[PDB]
């Protein structure tokens, strides 16, 4: 395995851990805030993904400091990951156009 491919793999593993830990902690931050809805694990899990993907429907979102601090980590994980895959694909493609020119 080439590095770009390892780091994407690493980032996909690490993204999943962030999505799960994120779900757990979002519920743990958000319970105790009256009106908070991000307060059960299953939909937390859905929230974490709609967050890391930057889709962000807003059906759900945090309203407490630590919710928001957890949310900011999920986003960054999301964006970094979905930009290391791109960087990896860009390096795979560049490699293949180098061979198709003889280099």
């Amino acid at each position: 395995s080439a590095l770009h491919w390892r780091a994407a793999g690493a980032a996909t593993v690490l993204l999943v851990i962030v999505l799960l830990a994120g779900s757990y902690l979002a519920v743990l931050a958000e319970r105790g805030a009256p009106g908070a809805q991000l307060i059960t694990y299953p939909r937390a899990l859905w929230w974490s993904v709609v967050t890391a993907t930057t889709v962000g429907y807003g059906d759900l979102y945090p309203v407490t400091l630590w919710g928001r601090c957890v949310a900011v980590v999920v986003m960054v994980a999301g964006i970094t990951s979905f930009g290391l895959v791109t960087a990896a694909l860009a390096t795979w493609f560049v490699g293949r156009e180098q061979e198709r020119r003889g280099h």
Partner: antibody, heavy 118, light 108 residues
Framework: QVQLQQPGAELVKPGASVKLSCKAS????????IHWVKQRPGHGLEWIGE????????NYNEKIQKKATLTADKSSSTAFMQLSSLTSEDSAVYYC???????????WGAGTTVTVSS | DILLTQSPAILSVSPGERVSFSCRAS??????IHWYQQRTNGSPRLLIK???ESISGIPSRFSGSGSGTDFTLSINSVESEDIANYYC?????????FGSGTKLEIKR
């Protein structure tokens, strides 16, 4: 196998305090919340508070006076609720109940009848 | 804090007849309503979760229905064992809240 095990009764002198136990058997998870629910005679169910024994965080009913303080013993699988400086208002049955963090109370204890008198 | 309203408080039905209990949320809670039975001197017992879903253990005689603000627990053909106090309970917004409750009462 009875999952939530609670004392039948505690007598308490007005002004005094009391620690209610709730020993849990069956599947435990990290995810699990223990809840406490107050029922005065001929009245209905009131949500007091919740604790997650794994991380030890608890939350309580703002909407009522904050008599209670919640604790767990990770090792002995027990939740405690500490009701302090009681009066006859506080004379009720206190149920504990297990919620998997998915919103419903799947299982309840038999509750503890707490009587505040001299 | 979401307000659960159970009218009527008492429900008089005849043996084997269909009965429905109403639970209205002060604001849309989706399907995040749960129904409990409490007989005299008993602890609460989950009948229905997320408005409609069966609990295994519970008679098929029990169903729920509803979305947003209007919810409904129904018993097709009531019998004596059904005599108890019914409560609804929301999980949609912190903190969880309960219905004031409704008494099922059979005229025999």
């Amino acid at each position: 196998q009875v999952q939530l095990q609670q004392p039948g009764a505690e007598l308490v002198k007005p002004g005094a305090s009391v620690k209610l136990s709730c020993k849990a058997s069956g599947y435990t998870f990290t995810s699990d919340w223990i809840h406490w629910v107050k029922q005065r005679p001929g009245h209905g169910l009131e949500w007091i508070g919740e604790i997650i024994p794994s991380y030890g965080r608890a939350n309580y009913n703002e909407k009522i006076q904050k008599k209670a303080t919640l604790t767990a013993d990770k090792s002995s699988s027990t939740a405690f609720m500490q009701l302090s400086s009681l009066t006859s208002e506080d004379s009720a049955v206190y149920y504990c109940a297990r919620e998997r963090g998915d919103g419903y109370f799947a299982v309840w204890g038999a509750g503890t009848t707490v009587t505040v008198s001299s | 804090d979401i307000l659960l309203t159970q009218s009527p408080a008492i429900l008089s039905v005849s043996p084997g007849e269909r009965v429905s209990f109403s639970c209205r949320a002060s604001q849309s809670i989706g399907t995040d309503i749960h129904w409990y039975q409490q007989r005299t001197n008993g602890s609460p017992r989950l009948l229905i979760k997320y408005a409609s879903e069966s609990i295994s253990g519970i008679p098929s005689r029990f169903s729920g229905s509803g979305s947003g603000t209007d919810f409904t627990l129904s018993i097709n053909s009531v019998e004596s064992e059904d005599i108890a106090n019914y409560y609804c309970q929301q999980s949609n917004r912190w903190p969880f809240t309960f219905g004031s409750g409704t008494k099922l009462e059979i005229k025999r």
